[PDB]
Each structure stands twice: as C-alpha cells, then as structure tokens.
C-alpha cells in the first residue's frame, strides 16, 4: 500500500511494486548485496546481523 502523510497507518492506494520485486527486495534485505555493489552499505544482511 501507499499511505497518507497525516495518517501514516491509513492506506490510500497501491504501490506498483510487484510480487517478484517485493520478494527480491526482501531477499536483499535478508542477505545483502555483493561486495562489488556500489549500494552495498544500504542493506546490512539480516542473516548476519
């Protein structure tokens, strides 16, 4: 969902993020990027932390 600013807990629409993209993002949060990735620092692996 997308949420309203005044009411952060109220959905006001749908994000375009698909199921494949959602699960890929969750996987990257779980395990992190490769060491050569410029965005490596963004997601510390939850499997390690």
């Amino acid at each position: 969902y997308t949420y309203s600013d005044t009411e952060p807990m109220q959905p006001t629409g749908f994000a375009t993020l698909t199921s494949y993209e959602y699960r890929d993002g969750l996987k990257i949060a779980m395990y992190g990027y490769d060491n050569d990735s410029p965005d490596f620092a963004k997601k510390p692996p939850a499997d390690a932390t």
């Binding site: 490596f40 620092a41 963004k42 510390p44 932390t49």
Partner: protein, 34 residues
C-alpha cells in the same frame, strides 16, 4: 642413626596476592550499519 642433617633444600618464599575491582559500564545500543 640420628640424622643430624637432612636435605631440607633451599629457602623459597611464595607470596600469593589477590586483586579485585568492581566496574559499572554504560554501553550504547549501536545500530548495525555498514
């Protein structure tokens, strides 16, 4: 026979010492950041 001398060996003095401290430490809950 009455042993007037026997091998008592060297005089060695051993001293045992104990050192105690109590410390109170404050630790920050640092985030896991790369």
């Amino acid at each position: 026979a009455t042993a007037i001398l026997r091998p008592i060996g060297l005089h060695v003095e051993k001293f045992q010492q104990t050192y105690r401290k109590k410390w109170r430490f404050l630790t920050s809950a640092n985030a896991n950041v790369i």
